[PDB]
Symmetry: D2
Subunit: 225 residues, 4 copies
């Protein structure tokens, strides 16, 4: 595609103009992320989302837009009675989703594809508190420059990054980075996980800028809770 | 825009190719109508949709695609705490939405726009049974040829066309005719209304072809029930 | 206990004074049956009630109060993660429970006890329609005298008496006959099943009288739907 | 009635035998308080409980069992479309209700009666934190002897003791003190409010003992959340 970023002429408000592939960024009515609030959410009988992850990390990469751990694709979650395989997880500071108009300092996205290429993203909010042992396995080898990949020595257990309480918000949205494709199932856990001040600072300094897309209009959607 | 229809080179499967304005018909992942079934629906605490219609019909038109009653825009429903004003209502045979993979013989759409142009459509299924007195007010002056408009003499009470039980399915979808714009709130009443064999036959003969868009993939969406 | 019936000083309105063990039947605040209506019901995320019945019927008995099929106690239903074993099932005409104040012609009750003696009743409504083959297995050998037991010449499959759709109403209730004991789990299925008019007529004649207790005050309860 | 307390032959475990009017306190199947946990709670479309209190406090009383503020009965809450009038409110340390088996340091009860004598209690949990100004209005004039009543020198606004978020748990329950009467509507608010450690300490010292009844068997009930 074409070069995109978070500020200036290539920032989020301009993404739809940068490449024909990115049209959804501007024409889409079901875009992500969103604000999750009292007026837009509705109590619903949402199925438990069961997690069956494995330790098949390949590497960690700094791609200039995030820090991402690329997985082998063997582990999966179950959504809508189907297996969605974990391909990668990556991070944003501050959070992309907001709750009652407020950001969390950090948000992790676990990106899954089913047999037919349909996408489900699990979102986990982080608050500052105790050091996160699982996050540290990745952080201790975080690539400091864009384009760098590092082989991970410790075994990665992505399940340990999820909250203990697995209650979630669900809505139909989009990828939050170009091409901002729609038909994406979002599963955003209600309970935040903790990370240390130091862990958050390390990520923010390595990135050097906020890498969150602004929240998008809910339009016709309800968020299920 | 450009000429579209329900068969041949201008049929629904081709709409997205007929005009630049119609791109959503083919790129959209949140399209209407849909099948409403057990696997795609979820029990939700949906707000009552209150109806405050008035008798401000202007005329009935056969536009070659449907029979439509154009309203003045004074009456409204309340959805998401906002007034959506009734602009027009019109009809499809067989139904556009299906339930458990099955059509109803007929479906009415009541099209509403809020202050900012956002669209809400209320859908009402009809089954064959007793003659519908309210429908007859329109049917007795139904324009038989495309492009014809008739002034309505009887006072139209669109509320009398809704089911007595106002429980509904809700989802985020699209217009079912070009340009198939998304961000449309759908409110599809669960209980069907009755019309006579004769009323259904009259509509179908005047139209001369089935004017339903095929059901579209649910993709990331849940239907709320 | 004591003695009881459906008319006069032994009818439902009097049961409560006929014994100190027939107490709850006046001091009780959680009695059955009830009217199930819009005002008293709340949409709730009710777990599916799974049914695992076996053909262990022992005998069919006319005990003067109903026509009853006594089971071996091996089949069971799962409610609140616990197994409740089918001890017996029996019949009422007209229905004991009402929906929106209206009776069904006929109601079947399936009575279950867990390991610790706790009771669950499943209720099934019947409407007049096509002859019920499973019911006919019992009808063709229906006993006619208070105290008379008869042997079943056919294999009884009680699950075949249940509706195909297993959605249900639930509340904390009572036995509908003295000692009108409380703490009964009630699972009343929404979809009625069909029996012949001839089938209904036979039960009503053999019974000779209406064997349904009038509906009881809901009090502090909600019905879950 | 009779006589009761929180230790020995007058403690909660014995109340049930101390009078024939203290009966339900052993034969009852619907008692309070209860543990509110994942297994016993079901997501449900609960109506908002609207609160319309007025400042009609008459006196604060130490009746040996609690510290109680008696109200004129003019303020009310709306439950099931009916008005339930605030007669009195009072306090427990530690909390009577538990959430997932864990006590809060403190619980407030607000006791309401409708026109026909039916009871609703609203429950509010307190955690240790910043000093509670509304609570302090009552504390600064707290009476210290069983039977002692004192006059309030400040205007009492009981609604200021409620959490800002009014989401709640609901069940069909009992009084938590003899005659432990059933058919009580329980509305227990989810969000706790803050009091000072000094505030908690005073109540605990003035009381001298734990005045919370142990949690009771859920039986056939579900808690709605
Ligand atoms: Cl779901
Ligand atoms: Cl809603
Ligand atoms: Cl349940
Ligand atoms: Cl409610
Ligand atoms: Zn992301
Ligand atoms: Zn239409
Ligand atoms: Zn029965
Ligand atoms: Zn209390």
């Amino acid at each position: 595609g074409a070069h995109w970023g978070y500020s200036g002429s290539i920032g989020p408000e301009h993404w739809g103009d940068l490449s024909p592939e990115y049209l959804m960024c501007k024409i889409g009515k079901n875009q992500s992320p969103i604000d999750i609030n009292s007026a837009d959410a509705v109590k619903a009988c949402l199925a438990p989302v069961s997690v069956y992850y494995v330790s098949d990390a390949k590497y960690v990469v700094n791609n200039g837009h995030t820090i991402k751990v690329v997985m082998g694709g063997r582990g999966y979650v179950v959504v809508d009675g189907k297996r969605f395989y974990l391909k990668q997880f990556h991070f944003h500071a501050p959070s992309e989703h907001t709750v009652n108009g407020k950001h969390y300092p950090f948000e992790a996205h676990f990106v899954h594809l089913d047999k037919n290429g349909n996408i489900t993203v699990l979102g986990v909010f982080f608050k500052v508190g105790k050091e996160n042992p699982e996050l540290e396995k990745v952080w201790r080898v975080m690539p400091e420059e864009p384009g760098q990949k590092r082989h991970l020595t410790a075994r990665i257990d992505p399940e340990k990054l999820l909250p203990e309480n697995r209650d979630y918000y669900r809505y139909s949205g989009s990828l939050t980075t170009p091409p901002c494709s729609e038909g994406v199932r979002w599963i955003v856990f209600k309970e935040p996980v903790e990370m240390s001040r130091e862990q958050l600072e390390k990520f923010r300094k390595v990135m050097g800028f906020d890498n969150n897309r602004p929240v998008q209009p809910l339009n016709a959607r309800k968020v299920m809770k």
